[PDB]
Amino acid sequence: AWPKVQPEVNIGVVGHVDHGKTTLVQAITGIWTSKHSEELKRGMTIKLGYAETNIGVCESCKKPEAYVTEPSCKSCGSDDEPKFLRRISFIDAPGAEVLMATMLSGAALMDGAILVVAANEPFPQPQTREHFVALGIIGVKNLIIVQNKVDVVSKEEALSQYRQIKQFTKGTWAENVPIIPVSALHKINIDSLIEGIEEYIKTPYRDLSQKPVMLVIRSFDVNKPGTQFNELKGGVIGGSIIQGLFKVDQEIKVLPGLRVEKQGKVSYEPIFTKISSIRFGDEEFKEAKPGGLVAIGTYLDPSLTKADNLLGSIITLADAEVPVLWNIRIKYNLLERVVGAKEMLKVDPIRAKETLMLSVGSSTTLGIVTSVKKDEIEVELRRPVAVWSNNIRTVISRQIAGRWRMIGWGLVEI
Ligand SMILES: Nc1nc2c(ncn2[C@@H]2O[C@H](COP(=O)(O)OP(=O)(O)NP(=O)(O)O)[C@@H](O)[C@H]2O)c(=O)[nH]1
Ligand SMILES: Nc1nc2c(ncn2[C@@H]2O[C@H](COP(=O)(O)OP(=O)(O)NP(=O)(O)O)[C@@H](O)[C@H]2O)c(=O)[nH]1
Ligand SMILES: [Mg+2]
């Protein structure tokens, strides 16, 4: 048998709209990540999608077919049980250009990524470029490029695009990134991709001694109709542990917390609760480490967590000291041009009184620029952000021609 363990690594799946990200995650895991009504009706990813799978290898078989996602080697002609390697998970991003902020929130959770490129579309499409640039900025450099939909192009066409992809990465941080051709729809060469994931997206070192921090991307009311009181539960908060670890029965807090009134002014009150349960996928555990998206059960009124209310928050231990800032100072750099537009225009300098969009951890916040210098801006935010470490990465977007566009990045200075 294979052990039941949490996933130990998060692999992002990014790329231009409809290039096959969600279908690729389904080919690997058997799971369709889209769970929302609007997603099913529109046939698109809107919220971050999630799926897990075990990975093993049949030691008597040849590679790549030796790599499997279930405890059988019958497919490669062996009655032996495959050796368990690890459990992995996928963060499935939306490709829609209007949803770049959601992609950015997901990239904060990624240990590595797959950039999906459709073989039957011109290269490089706007969000092929934009998601690529985003990965570089955020530092998700453990990248595999997947050439998808090879089932609907000729070998000559696939090879032509392959050369253009290598020339695109030439002279960049991604110069040595592998390109793996697949058909996600027809599950062709998926075993080669699994081998690639093992080779190029290793599980990173973790620091379990660091103060526990979870970035929140989901929150739920888990109570269903037709249930007895015996099985009813408090609110559930979902996200990624980025350092340390959490345990059942630990006192925790949600930051910045709840928007309330205090002294005639808007304030955020830290939400204190206790961990009632820990789940990854369909399995319960007593503790949670980095890797995977964890569901933290709490004793909170489920009305506090319903419908992703706490998206963008962080969770820490109750006694942790974490800055919660209404005003932030950013040591920044600007991109040369707007890479996500159909026509890439020059990026204008930041000006005082501009409204910018700031991506910090899983959070997305608008703010007004109150100060500009050569290397530094100060921003007054509409909602405070939890800043759990010094020099956390932020991504800066500007509204250009009616769309939020990534224009730069920086370090939040505390
Ligand atoms: N021929 C072919 N079609 C594919 C392949 N992979 C995906 N498609 C098709 O491409 C369409 C989009 O697939 P989807 O996985 O939803 O793409 P996406 O990149 O997740 N879209 P979004 O950016 O909106 O999340 C679907 O009709 C799907 O069946 C493939 O390998 N071959
Ligand atoms: N810690 C913990 N997580 C749970 C518990 N029950 C469900 N979850 C997690 O919460 C998420 C949603 O649960 P699920 O029952 O699948 O769907 P749901 O509760 O109907 N959510 P929604 O109403 O948003 O559809 C999943 O990630 C699941 O693993 C629980 O008792 N404890
Ligand atoms: Mg999708």
From Swiss-Prot:
<feature type="region of interest" description="G5">
    <location>
        <begin position="183"/>
        <end position="185"/>
    </location>
</feature>
<comment type="subunit">
    <text>Heterotrimer composed of an alpha, a beta and a gamma chain.</text>
</comment>
<dbReference type="InterPro" id="IPR005225">
    <property type="entry name" value="Small_GTP-bd"/>
</dbReference>
<keyword id="KW-0460">Magnesium</keyword>
<dbReference type="GO" id="GO:0005525">
    <property type="term" value="F:GTP binding"/>
</dbReference>
<dbReference type="GO" id="GO:0046872">
    <property type="term" value="F:metal ion binding"/>
</dbReference>
<feature type="binding site">
    <location>
        <position position="22"/>
    </location>
    <ligand>
        <name>Mg(2+) 1</name>
    </ligand>
</feature>
<feature type="binding site">
    <location>
        <position position="58"/>
    </location>
    <ligand>
        <name>Zn(2+)</name>
    </ligand>
</feature>
<keyword id="KW-0547">Nucleotide-binding</keyword>
<feature type="binding site">
    <location>
        <begin position="18"/>
        <end position="23"/>
    </location>
    <ligand>
        <name>GTP</name>
    </ligand>
</feature>
<feature type="region of interest" description="G4">
    <location>
        <begin position="148"/>
        <end position="151"/>
    </location>
</feature>
<feature type="region of interest" description="G3">
    <location>
        <begin position="92"/>
        <end position="95"/>
    </location>
</feature>
<dbReference type="Pfam" id="PF00009">
    <property type="entry name" value="GTP_EFTU"/>
</dbReference>
<feature type="binding site">
    <location>
        <begin position="148"/>
        <end position="151"/>
    </location>
    <ligand>
        <name>GTP</name>
    </ligand>
</feature>
<dbReference type="InterPro" id="IPR022424">
    <property type="entry name" value="TIF2_gsu"/>
</dbReference>
<dbReference type="InterPro" id="IPR000795">
    <property type="entry name" value="T_Tr_GTP-bd_dom"/>
</dbReference>
<feature type="binding site">
    <location>
        <position position="76"/>
    </location>
    <ligand>
        <name>Zn(2+)</name>
    </ligand>
</feature>
<keyword id="KW-0342">GTP-binding</keyword>
<feature type="region of interest" description="G1">
    <location>
        <begin position="15"/>
        <end position="22"/>
    </location>
</feature>
<dbReference type="GO" id="GO:0003746">
    <property type="term" value="F:translation elongation factor activity"/>
</dbReference>
<comment type="function">
    <text>eIF-2 functions in the early steps of protein synthesis by forming a ternary complex with GTP and initiator tRNA.</text>
</comment>
<dbReference type="Pfam" id="PF09173">
    <property type="entry name" value="eIF2_C"/>
</dbReference>
<feature type="binding site">
    <location>
        <position position="61"/>
    </location>
    <ligand>
        <name>Zn(2+)</name>
    </ligand>
</feature>
<dbReference type="InterPro" id="IPR015256">
    <property type="entry name" value="eIF2g_C"/>
</dbReference>
<keyword id="KW-0479">Metal-binding</keyword>
<keyword id="KW-0648">Protein biosynthesis</keyword>
<feature type="binding site">
    <location>
        <position position="73"/>
    </location>
    <ligand>
        <name>Zn(2+)</name>
    </ligand>
</feature>
<dbReference type="InterPro" id="IPR009001">
    <property type="entry name" value="Transl_elong_EF1A/Init_IF2_C"/>
</dbReference>
<feature type="binding site">
    <location>
        <position position="45"/>
    </location>
    <ligand>
        <name>Mg(2+) 1</name>
    </ligand>
</feature>
<dbReference type="GO" id="GO:0000049">
    <property type="term" value="F:tRNA binding"/>
</dbReference>
<dbReference type="GO" id="GO:0003743">
    <property type="term" value="F:translation initiation factor activity"/>
</dbReference>
<keyword id="KW-0378">Hydrolase</keyword>
<dbReference type="InterPro" id="IPR027417">
    <property type="entry name" value="P-loop_NTPase"/>
</dbReference>
<keyword id="KW-0396">Initiation factor</keyword>
<feature type="binding site">
    <location>
        <position position="43"/>
    </location>
    <ligand>
        <name>Mg(2+) 2</name>
    </ligand>
</feature>
<protein>
    <recommendedName>
        <fullName>Translation initiation factor 2 subunit gamma</fullName>
        <ecNumber>3.6.5.3</ecNumber>
    </recommendedName>
</protein>
<dbReference type="GO" id="GO:0003924">
    <property type="term" value="F:GTPase activity"/>
</dbReference>
<feature type="domain" description="tr-type G">
    <location>
        <begin position="6"/>
        <end position="205"/>
    </location>
</feature>
<dbReference type="InterPro" id="IPR050543">
    <property type="entry name" value="eIF2G"/>
</dbReference>
<feature type="region of interest" description="G2">
    <location>
        <begin position="43"/>
        <end position="47"/>
    </location>
</feature>
<comment type="similarity">
    <text>Belongs to the TRAFAC class translation factor GTPase superfamily. Classic translation factor GTPase family. EIF2G subfamily.</text>
</comment>
<dbReference type="InterPro" id="IPR044127">
    <property type="entry name" value="eIF2g_dom_2"/>
</dbReference>
